[model samples]
Target chain A: FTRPPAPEKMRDLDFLLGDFRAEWTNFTADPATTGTAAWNTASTFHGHAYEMTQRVEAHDLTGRFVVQWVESESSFSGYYYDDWGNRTLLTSEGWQDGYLAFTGECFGFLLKEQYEIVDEKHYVKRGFIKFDEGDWIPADEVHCHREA
Target chain B: AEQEFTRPPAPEKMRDLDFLLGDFRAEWTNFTADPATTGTAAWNTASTFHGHAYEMTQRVEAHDLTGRFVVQWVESESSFSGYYYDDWGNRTLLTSEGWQDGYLAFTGECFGSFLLKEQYEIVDEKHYVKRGFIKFDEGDWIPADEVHCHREA
Candidate 1:
């Protein structure tokens, strides 16, 4: 079967490809849980076009993966899955204010997550959550550095 | 305000719907009034809604039509239902699912005179087919569209 080539937008995310050491804070926790996480990002395809996959592990948790791909020039889709079978779908519009943002709803809360590229070797990931009529509350913060 | 909802496992019936998941390159025939006009579409699906449902997004480049649909089973109703919203301001609420002769069927309504009927029949793991119809008050179901899709590999 013929598959489409990797779109420019998907290629734009190359900065995130590779292994990373991540330190994060779960601000939503009662006493903000701080932990270290590791990430491995790669390009993959499920018999279709090129897509990006991010495998992550944080502290006691493992086997968390996010599959992301370009749907169009202005939109991309991100699917988050974990070993427990928990999943969330985040669809984002293209770059906004120099950052790529993805948002979705999960477990009765709205999830807002974004990644800001600092350079080829570093980036910052910020996550937030919100309930109806409530402001977005910082839920997690991650600083990722490419592993040497 | 706190809401209480169980994180239920994906039901057994939902397993039948898994064939529709993943990326796909779709070709549409008889998609519109002009039968000769054919086009390609992109269909993408991912597990969503707390992993209890699958979300499907369809984009037809020829017509500039993009729609978002969520498929899930309704425990209270003991059936499958779908909510579809199109960029063109059309919203369809689909309910009632049944399988017969290897084809799964569902009916939909968009608050209009005609009802929508959709069918999904698997051809294999890599390829599948879809058919859609519109039914009028007189109970005549006319062919609306047909699609053949190949799973991305």
Candidate 2:
């Protein structure tokens, strides 16, 4: 029932806890899709767990994200769940080179997502995918602005 | 490139957690505050999840404190994943290997130096016990906290 405080490195994600609006540009869409997300962190366990709920009205989509730093692995275990029941597990070796990068397998492709805090009021979320371990092809490009 | 795949429906196993819903009374003990102490506690559970997973949030009003835990079901792993967070500022992640031998069991590391084992043992429709244990080394699990509960009438 007793646990030590979260690792000092978790504070690096503090600025990301808030409401945000983003324009999601998926090549499958003819126009950019608008999405919103709310992020919060909990320090009640071994490491800080960041939970998020997001929605995209244009696509009638809603999803959840739960990411936590696993001390034993020295990495972040990120889970993404969609309303349609498709889920993916991503692993990140913490923030590197100004971005927190996560890689996973999705829909038979190797997927990678990178997150960066552009500043105090904005951030960037982008994705890449590869089939044969060749060069990555851009899949998703999103620019998010803090709303609260 | 675009991709297409079949999506899974929300799991039927999630219904098993419905046992935790409804009102309950607790003959609670505070292992964190006393060597051996007991008091009254009230608790109820509710849930709301999207398609393949479920998130259950339990609200507790114990004799000494009030807190809640949001436990999530991730479809990819079919395993339970969530953290317990309370008003006292205690938050801990708990993962379980699903229900086994009539118990929802979870055991994981804590503080990077210790181990914690927690379980929900439902005796029947009217009784259940929430148990906790701690391990400091390569030793037996030591009972640390527990809550004996019954469905309130």
Candidate 3:
């Protein structure tokens, strides 16, 4: 399908672009998470996870995309852009009831995505899955707050 | 000396409801900030008694109140009895237990003494700042509460 140009595409993912900060309470006794988040620029994506590198791209009015790769690790880790982002290669967007599903490639994997609008100035972006339809989920859900 | 029940010449400073001899209407402002219910007073004690008074004590029955006293004021003696209202609009019913240490006190109520004198400063045409206290309870009566009054027209 013909896609929207980069400008319009990025417009759809506007929530994804910006400097960000986050606090997550995952409802766990030892619920784990990162306390701060940031998107280096509106024009280009630059952020890192403790275990992976993140890259994002957008096509006008249509496809906004994101990709995350394991650090020097041959793990098929990456993300796709939609209303929210979808893990590029899995059945579990963020992990389904303790199981991972894979779709694109790489042995046994899955994908999932979780997106939420919090008030006027915040959004939550989560993408992840598991291996072999087993217990795997997004280890980190990033909160991106609007930038000045 | 004139009669068997001669009230011991109400103390020199005993509030005489007389100085405030003119007719004035009393309205309660229970909650000031609340625009809707702010100006509502459960009952009004119009100038039923003013001017030509030796010492007068009045009681308001509504809001479970009693023993409110006032005497001819301005010069001879101006006094206030038990009925008191807190800044929060809660009305306290007063009962006088008679005189104590040259002052009159209401048991479990206001202990009126010469030491207690109302300090007044005009805030505007309708309000005055007043402060007084009772040593018994360490409770000081400060103008923390606002009393909106108007001369009876």
Q: Which lDDT value does model 2 have at A9?
A: 64
How many steric overlaps are in each model, in order? 4, 4, 43
Clashing pairs in 2: A44-B91, A44-B92, A45-B91, A45-B92
- Model 2 residue B46 distance off true place after TM-score fit, in angstroms: 2.0
lDDT of 3 by residue, B28-108 (tens): 443223451323122223322112122222223243332223222122112233333221122232333333443333323
Off by over 4 Å in 3: A1-7, A24-33, A44-108, A134-138, B1-153
> Which 10 consecutive positions of candidate 3 chain A have the poorest summed lDDT?
A44-53
lDDT of 3 by residue, A56-75 (tens): 22211112233222222323
How high is the lDDT of residue B105 in model 3? 35
The per-residue C-alpha lDDT of model 2 at residue A145 equals 80
Please rank every candidate by lDDT, starting with the best: 1, 2, 3
Please state the error at residue B150 of candidate 3 in Å: 98
DockQ of 1: 0.03
State which candidate, 2 or 3, has the greater TM-score: 2
All candidates: TM-score = 0.53, 0.70, 0.26
> Cα lDDT for residue B7, model 2?
41
Candidate 2 docks at the CAPRI level of acceptable
Off by over 4 Å in 2: A1-11, A27-50, A67-79, A88-91, A104-111, A130-135, B1-8, B30-34, B40-43, B51-78, B82-95, B111-114, B135-139, B151-153
